[PDB]
Design a protein around this nucleic acid. Structure first.
Ligand SMILES: *C[C@@](*)(O)[C@H](CCCNC(N)=[NH2+])NC(=O)[C@@H]1CCCN1C(=O)[C@H](N)Cc1ccccc1
Ligand SMILES: *[C@@H]1O[C@H](CO)[C@@H](O)[C@H](O)[C@H]1NC(C)=O
Ligand SMILES: [K+]
Ligand code: NA
Lengths: 259, 34
DNA sequence: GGTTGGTGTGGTTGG
């Protein structure tokens, strides 16, 4: 997260860390939607162009974390994956269309002050809040700057970062990039003439873009950190998977079995 | 199956459940007016 | 020492 701040403890208790078993590596963010389901971005698990194809046994999920690197004993829960379900129409070749994936835990996780699921949106919440100028919140342990070129500052934070960002009008999203945008995506971030900054970055993929309902004051996940071009560049906007638009596939897998 | 947690989703134990707002949460509410 | 750092021996938490 670029230009965000340290998150307060318990502030994003649905924040999940997707972790590579060996070598040990923080891979992406993800979110908790129940005691046994985790949401993340498909490209975090499967991205053929970079030779990325993870399997359930390669991964771990770290739930309830704050610190990026120390083991928060008796706070965080580490869970194995029973199954990974990638959207069957995830377009990895073209533009990360339907950049979403569900991960089923081996064993259900107990909730606590640091572990609680976020709500999935319904039509009224999406119709009401997914509007240009309306702000959402993005969280992650991802990069603090573009790390692929020389830049001042630490590349990673010691603690989870947060940043609030305004959703942007689709025409502006569409004209800001040559990558073909889709209705399964939405962009957010300040414009150059707004004089406020912030963006998700590499390493934040799979984290949630959440909004707080002013109707029942519950937090809802509207988007999944998906892609962008650079991090916090003027005229550019971070892109997010449109959770509600893929809601039907989500219910479909989550409610498939009764076990 | 969905599992436990749907009915209580989106209510944070250290904030909403204690009637405590976090530090920038009002900034979201304010952007939702008009 | 510990499926990990240090103002430690609690803490966002045991031993
Ligand atoms: C996987 C994620 O961590 C990451 C999120 C980046 C979000 N960036 C901003 N500024 N909000 N996604 C990626 O790195 C994806 C995977 C493929 C490369 N990529 C991009 O976002 C490229 N930067 C752009 C792109 C390339 C090909 C297809 C779509 C987008
Ligand atoms: C990913 O790897 C599995 C086996 O490990 C393979 O069956 C699957 O087809 C791969 N997906 C790709 C590269 O499209
Ligand atoms: K200790
Ligand atoms: Na920007």
């Amino acid at each position: 997260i670029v230009e965000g701040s340290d998150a307060e403890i318990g502030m994003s208790p649905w924040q999940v860390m997707l972790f590579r078993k060996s070598p040990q590596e923080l891979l992406c963010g993800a979110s908790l939607i129940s005691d046994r389901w985790v949401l993340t971005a498909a490209h975090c698990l499967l991205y053929p162009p970079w030779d990325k194809n993870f399997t359930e046994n390669d991964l771990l999920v770290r739930i309830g974390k704050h610190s990026r690197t120390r083991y928060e004993r008796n706070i965080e829960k580490i869970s194995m994956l029973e199954k990974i379900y990638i959207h069957p129409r995830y377009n990895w070749r073209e533009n990360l269309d339907r950049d979403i994936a569900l991960m089923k835990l081996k064993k259900p996780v107990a909730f606590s002050d640091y572990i609680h699921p976020v709500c999935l949106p319904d039509r009224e919440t999406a119709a009401s809040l997914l509007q240009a100028g309306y702000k959402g919140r993005v969280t992650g342990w991802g990069n603090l700057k573009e790390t692929w070129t020389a830049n001042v500052g630490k590349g990673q934070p010691s603690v989870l970062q947060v940043v609030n960002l305004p959703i942007v009008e689709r025409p502006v999203c569409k004209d800001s990039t040559r990558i073909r945008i889709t209705d399964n995506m939405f962009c957010a971030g300040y414009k150059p003439d707004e004089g406020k900054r912030g963006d998700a970055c590499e390493g934040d993929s799979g984290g949630p873009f959440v909004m707080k309902s002013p109707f029942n004051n519950r937090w809802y996940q509207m988007g999944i950190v998906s892609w962008g071009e650079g991090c916090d560049r003027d005229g550019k906007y971070g892109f997010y998977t449109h959770v509600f638009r893929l809601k039907k596939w989500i219910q479909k897998v989550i409610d498939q079995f009764g076990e | 199956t969905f599992g436990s947690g749907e009915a209580d989703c989106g209510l944070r134990p250290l904030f909403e459940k204690k009637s405590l707002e976090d530090k920038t949460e009002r900034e979201l509410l304010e952007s939702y007016i008009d």
